Design a protein around this ligand. Structure first.
Ligand SMILES: CC(C)=CCC/C(C)=C/CC/C(C)=C/CO
Lengths: 104, 270
């Protein structure tokens, strides 16, 4: 039957402005295998994103890792956009990072 | 513990996609090239102790995939296979051996001792599929020898050649952040752990020596460099976030746990 994807976003290293890092989007638990996943920078699609080979778990649900090398700045906001036959609309999961304390 | 996965998506009678890959324990080691029709070796120790045997392994897999796709196309209507459908197969070994096939992501048939047996839930359509798969007993004997004999020879050439890879110890790094903040008056404390290998890891929020049993450990997620990632979250009231720390235990640290403290701009201090 059909299964909706679980979407989990994470960076390889702690967020540090000006330091190169890796943004990851692990999409798993979905069926069928046709899916479109995009990494977003300030709402704009990031080009030349790599993804691992399609695989599946013991329960036959598929999973994929999308990733790209990136350098965050203070204003930038990153997220993962996934569309699938189980979704009414593309689901967007943000990369949650701290920007330090708010007040100076 | 080597196993091979096989993904075949049948969009219609004249369009398809085929993805194949081999795995040692949890490390991907081989990939099939549909255009080149050859086995690609992800790592130098993926060739094993076999030299050139690979040409037969390729053409054997080439023939058996040619028969599979044409056989599925021929018997699709007889098997009540409705486009678009997907067939997944995983076959492997360990003392153990397995070969299972799924239709539309559900258990359909499995290869037991010397023949394909249907999963009783999959109904008469799986029994008819086993009739086609069990047409030639010599083909099933070849499948039996691949699982019981050919695979242990494959692990012999792979596990010994790449033992330094699976047993390597890579130290984790960790950091702290605020979570999406569930509930008014509460905070979500997030402890990230990335870059560690192998997979077993220990992470807990602490108040001194007292493990905080509210620690919600996420899934261990893969990283493209071969290491792993994990988030462990603790939800606390805004006032009682004092003297909290994240402690990470890992085999690579040799007892030198990583300890991070909810401190500084995280609190935030004055
Ligand atoms: C790699 C070895 C020696 C055994 C693993 C079992 C195997 C080759 C499974 C192939 C999966 C498959 C559906 C192939 C196309 O029929």
């Amino acid at each position: 039957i059909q299964r909706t994807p679980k979407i989990q976003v994470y960076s390889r290293h702690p967020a540090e402005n000006g330091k190169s890092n890796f943004l990851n989007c692990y999409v798993s638990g979905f069926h069928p295998s046709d899916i479109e996943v995009d990494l977003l920078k300030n709402g704009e699609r990031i080009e030349k994103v790599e993804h691992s080979d399609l695989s599946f778990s013991k329960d036959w649900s598929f999973y994929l890792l999308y990733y790209t090398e990136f350098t965050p700045t203070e204003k930038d906001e990153y997220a993962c956009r996934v569309n699938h036959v189980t979704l009414s609309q593309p689901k967007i999961v943000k990369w949650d990072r701290d920007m330090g304390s708010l007040v100076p | 513990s080597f196993h091979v996965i096989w993904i075949a998506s049948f969009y219609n009678h004249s369009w398809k996609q085929n993805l194949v890959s081999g795995w040692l324990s949890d490390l991907q080691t081989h990939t099939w090239d549909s255009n080149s029709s050859t086995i690609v070796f992800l790592w130098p120790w993926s060739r094993g102790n076999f030299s050139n045997e690979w040409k037969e392994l390729e053409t054997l897999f080439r023939i058996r995939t040619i028969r599979s796709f044409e056989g599925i196309r021929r018997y699709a209507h007889e098997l009540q296979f409705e486009y678009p459908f997907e067939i997944q197969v995983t076959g492997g070994c360990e003392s153990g051996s397995f070969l299972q096939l799924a239709y539309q992501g559900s258990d359909f048939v499995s290869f037991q001792n010397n023949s394909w047996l249907p999963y009783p839930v999959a109904g008469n359509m799986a029994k008819h599929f086993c009739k086609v798969l069990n047409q030639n007993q010599h083909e099933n004997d070849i499948t039996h020898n691949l699982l019981s004999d050919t695979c242990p020879r494959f692990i012999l050439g792979l596990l010994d050649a790449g033992k330094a890879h699976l047993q390597r110890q890579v130290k984790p790094e960790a950091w702290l952040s605020h979570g999406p903040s569930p509930g008014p008056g509460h905070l979500q404390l997030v402890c990230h752990v990335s870059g560690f290998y192998p997979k077993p890891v220990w992470v807990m929020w602490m108040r001194g020596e007292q493990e905080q049993q509210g620690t919600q450990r996420g899934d261990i997620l893969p990283s493209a460099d071969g290491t792993w990632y994990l988030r462990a979250t603790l939800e606390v009231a805004a006032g009682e976030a004092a003297d909290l720390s994240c402690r990470v235990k890992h085999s690579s640290l040799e007892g030198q746990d990583i300890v991070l403290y909810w401190e500084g701009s995280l609190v935030p201090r004055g």
